[PDB]
Design a protein around this ligand. Sequence first.
Ligand SMILES: CN(C)Cc1cn(Cc2ccc(C(=O)NO)cc2)c2ccccc12
Ligand SMILES: [K+]
Ligand SMILES: [K+]
Ligand SMILES: [Zn+2]
Length: 638
Amino acid sequence: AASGSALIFDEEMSRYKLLWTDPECEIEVPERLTVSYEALRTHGLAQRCKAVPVRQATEQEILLAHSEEYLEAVKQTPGMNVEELMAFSKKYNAVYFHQNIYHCAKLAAGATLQLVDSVMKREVRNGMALVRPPGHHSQRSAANGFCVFNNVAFAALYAKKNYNLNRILIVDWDVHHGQGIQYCFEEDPSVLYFSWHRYEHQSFWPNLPESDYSSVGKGKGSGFNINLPWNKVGMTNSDYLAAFFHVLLPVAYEFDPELVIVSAGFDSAIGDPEGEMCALPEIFAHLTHLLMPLAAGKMCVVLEGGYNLTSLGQSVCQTVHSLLGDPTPRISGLGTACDSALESIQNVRNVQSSYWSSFKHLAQSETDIVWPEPLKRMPASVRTVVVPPPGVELTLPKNCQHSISESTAKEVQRIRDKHFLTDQNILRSLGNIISVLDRMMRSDEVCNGCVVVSDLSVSVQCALQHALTEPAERVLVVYVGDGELPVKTNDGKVFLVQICTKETEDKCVNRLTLCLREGESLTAGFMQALLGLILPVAYEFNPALVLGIVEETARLMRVWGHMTCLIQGLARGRMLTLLQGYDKDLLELTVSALSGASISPLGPLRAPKPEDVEMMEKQRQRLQERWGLLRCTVSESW
Ligand SMILES: CN(C)Cc1cn(Cc2ccc(C(=O)NO)cc2)c2ccccc12
Ligand SMILES: [K+]
Ligand SMILES: [K+]
Ligand SMILES: [Zn+2]
């Protein structure tokens, strides 16, 4: 039932700064907070968010993650002059103190708890806290790397204590390793920590052996710590997405967290003087979007780093846009991750194979920098149009509508006379397809839609052909059914995904046909193919429209909502779904996911059939030379 997105911010946290010269700490300025909040106001994003006030974290709350000794020492810094503050700062690595930093540290922490309470009390769907000082380097008895208290560690400990969550996922996409977080949950299997980070074979700060891929956690927590070290600078959108499709998401959906907290440091973005990576701000729209179907959307984004004020503003907007549900921007130029990234990726996957299903088949062997300003993102006036069979009034979610103009009806006749003849109620189906498609493609007024149809072949043809004419340069087709369709994948403008019951050997590289064995194992197998095959091809293909098609036959579709939601990362969310036959369940589920609603978790799934994982790896072997984003190992050289 929850709706809205929280934005927790307060200008008080910009009221401490570095007071002596120190080239390591110069980069961390109050303007990081000012610039990010002002960027959100300029784009009308703050105004769309529920402003939740900051509060101070209590002493009891700080002691969840820090020791009395260290809190006591920090509590004396407001009484210190600058000489004493310099001496106290020098006891720690890469941190400076200020008469107001204890105050703001308590606010940055309390802000995070406010966000956790709003989300877990269902007052909002998700949210973001813009805070200073950052947290993820902070440790039980020490400040480190601009961090005083560990805001994100707080949030998970607090969520554990006050809501009795058994499973919390923390995603740390800052460019630095959140070693404070890793230390805090090393032995705790109830918190899964994922972190990518510039490493460079341990030559990059904080220079820690245990920032490497081999630190998987300790004791009962083995396998719930996941480090992906970047060993070269300049990592791109393709590296980040390869990290998500082939490491993070396969683990996250199996973990099935009850809450997601994000250490959202944007020094991993292009232009940052410290990360020196190359991912565009747009990538964060997708990082956010790909995590949103977890935990019924309960996602708390907490700011960490980000030092290029321009890069910083644009990545914060891209994140809030996606929290608010705005359509995701198209990512072009995707391909293989670079070789160093594939090394890191395959090493993490191999070492994690002891602990996670999706990787288990790897163990047995029988199996001034400037860039283009991001485009405006804007919620469609009506997000989803729906065309149920004639005479079915239905309870539509808040942003939906039902169904034909003279222009349109003229066109259906032209198509009728040239290519078909037919005289039926299909003539209504095809008029609906066209008028829905025209609202999707022509206007930013409507985003996606679902039409119930009866005749499959004619419906598919008119939908596909009318789309290529608008023109939609490329169309991704996702078809759950058997047989072949009036779809030609020979010119490179169409890619066909087919989920079917009979195993049919496909030849060329513009078709991905998945035939999974029947039974209780089918749900886990579908999610593996979705995350590790379908999504990487689709993102590289970068279609302008997605056309979904479901045969009346298949029943076993507890997964359709997850794909509908993930697949809206492509084509700015422009997806038309054709449902063959009526099924109030499937139609209400499709419309709900299309409309941006919360998706219900999958929970525990029976791990997939070896015959299923083998068939999928046969598809990856067959397609990954054309679609490099499918690769999760370094390629063999001649
Ligand atoms: C490289 N630069 C010219 C100066 C410099 C800053 N630091 C500390 C630091 C801590 C944390 C974060 C962060 O954003 N974490 O998420 C960013 C920076 C250093 C440490 C060792 C050597 C040099 C430097
Ligand atoms: K990180
Ligand atoms: K853990
Ligand atoms: Zn950082």
